[PDB]
Design a protein around this ligand. Structure first.
Ligand SMILES: Cc1nc2cc(-c3ccccc3)nn2c(-c2cc(F)c3c(c2C)CCCO3)c1[C@H](OC(C)(C)C)C(=O)O
Ligand SMILES: Cc1nc2cc(-c3ccccc3)nn2c(-c2cc(F)c3c(c2C)CCCO3)c1[C@H](OC(C)(C)C)C(=O)O
Lengths: 139, 141
């Protein structure tokens, strides 16, 4: 479905990366966060929901995802949460980060470079698929 | 007019800087509260924007944070064309929504993200969020 996203956290260089994947397209949004907290997760979801049509979010049962702050943000945004593709995206994003890591001072820059590379990679790219999927659902 | 052209600007609110990006053809907005009006903050914002949407051209004023070599270098890496000098009212509308929802959040960054959500979902046939994907899908063909 065009409104389904998978979310998870991944670790790199003793830092936390919050990753969102649009399941149907492979399009990703990622951010380096100071810690895996409900406040960081809620803020990320609120940004994501204002940018794309977010209908359902699939996560695991980690405390940052089951947090009442997150539940309340989803209730405000009209998002359905479901607990218990993102497994491989973690590896691919980590591969691209490793490839460009020495081109940036900060890990957050390397992460945003990796998101750009991933989403533009073409014969459609993930960035083209997501808008094609969503535009057809609007008819 | 084109699906890859964005207008960027800085606004101030409560002693903080808000960087606002408007997709000119749709009225779609992306905004973030930044700790300081610097080339580094502006470059980082553009890098995130360019990885999320097709960004071909960025129109800004001649502010030092936009004329910065860090921003010029980030645009060069991303293949973005920079151009300097109704979207003047976008800062006013965003500030209007921010003011309406301000007491519903502790942090200004939250109120800004609530305002972006409200603005992009607003129908009064199509919303800005629908128009951006429709304009970009049309040009993909
Ligand atoms: C700290 C820092 N200083 C500087 C300085 C100059 C720079 C480069 C050429 C001429 C003049 C200045 N660029 N530049 C960058 C910079 C900015 C980008 F947008 C970017 C890239 C990088 C390396 C790589 C390609 C993708 O885009 C940074 C990065 O940090 C932030 C993103 C700012 C938080 C960093 O992590 O190194
Ligand atoms: C600090 C803070 N604490 C809390 C606590 C609870 C909360 C709400 C209901 C039950 C249990 C806890 N929510 N909540 C929020 C919160 C989170 C949202 F995603 C959000 C909204 C807000 C108010 C409003 C509607 C839009 O979505 C925040 C906000 O801060 C961050 C975004 C986290 C950085 C804030 O600035 O107030």
């Amino acid at each position: 479905s065009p409104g389904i996203w998978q979310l998870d956290c991944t670790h790199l260089e003793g830092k936390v990366i919050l990753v969102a994947v649009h399941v149907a397209s492979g399009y990703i949004e990622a951010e380096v966060i100071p810690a895996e907290t409900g406040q960081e997760t809620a803020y990320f979801l609120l940004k994501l929901a204002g940018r794309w049509p977010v209908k359902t979010v699939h996560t695991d049962n980690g405390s940052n995802f089951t947090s009442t702050t997150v539940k309340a943000a989803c209730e405000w945004a009209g998002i359905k949460q479901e607990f218990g593709v993102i497994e491989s995206m973690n590896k691919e994003l980590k591969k691209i980060i490793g490839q460009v890591r020495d081109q940036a001072e900060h890990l957050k820059t390397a992460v945003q470079m990796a998101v750009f590379i991933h989403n533009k990679k073409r014969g459609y790219s993930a960035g083209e698929r997501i808008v094609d999927i969503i535009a057809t659902d609007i008819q």
